[PDB]
Each structure stands twice: as structure tokens, then as C-alpha cells.
Chains A and B, each alone.
Chain A
């Protein structure tokens, strides 16, 4: 490719990244991000730590 800056679109360079997820088998790994809040004190509450 002889790329030049004065080239119509469709002739200018594009960078490409191809992500390919390939499963297999395991006991655990990456996953979503859990949410949280601001714990309190001196109040019957329903909590998860």
C-alpha cells in the first residue's frame, strides 16, 4: 500500500483488532464487576460483604 494523506476515504489506512474468545474448561476465572454502596451503623440492616 502506498498510503498518502490526500487519499479518499476507503483508501486510507484502518487499524483492525480481532478478538477471538476460545473456551475450553476450568474451575473459574474472569467475570463481571460487582456493585456496592455505603454501609451504615446503628440500624438493623440487610447486608452483603
Chain B
């Protein structure tokens, strides 16, 4: 479901690293990654938002944020 690069189409799609938590246990990462140590590092950064999101997914709906 994720879109790890800008597509093979010349496709108009906001290219900005981010981590999505749509709900129902569906986690997607949207970024346009190039082969660089810069995007090797922000891949580790954006996966960290996902592993934080996968952990508190057993709480009720209104408590699924960070603690502050």
C-alpha cells in the first residue's frame, strides 16, 4: 500500500516524507526516496513514527497520540 518512490508515471503527488496512521491497523509511509545517506537516515526516522504507532494501537481511540 505504501508508495516508497514517486511513481513511474509523471504523477502529481506531494513529495514529502511522512508517516500515516489511517486506522484499523493500516500503516503507510509516503516519501520519494533517493539513494543517499540522507534518505537512509530519514527512513530510520520515519519508521520510528510507525513503530510508535503500532505499539499504542490497543488503547481506545481518543488516547492514540504521544504522551505529550
Interface residues of A (CB under 8 A from B): 4, 6-11
Contacts and interface: CB of A to CB of B under 8 A. Distances in A.
15 contacts: A4-B24, A6-B1, A6-B26, A7-B24, A7-B25, A7-B26, A8-B24, A8-B25, A8-B26, A8-B27, A9-B25, A10-B25, A11-B24, A11-B25, A11-B26
Contacts, number: 15
Q: Is the interface of A mostly helix, strand, loop or mixed?
A: loop
Interface of B: 1, 24-27
B17 to A, nearest CB: 21
Contacts of B25: 7-11
A16 to B, nearest CB: 19
Contacts of B1: 6
Contacts of A8: 24-27
B22 to A, nearest CB: 8
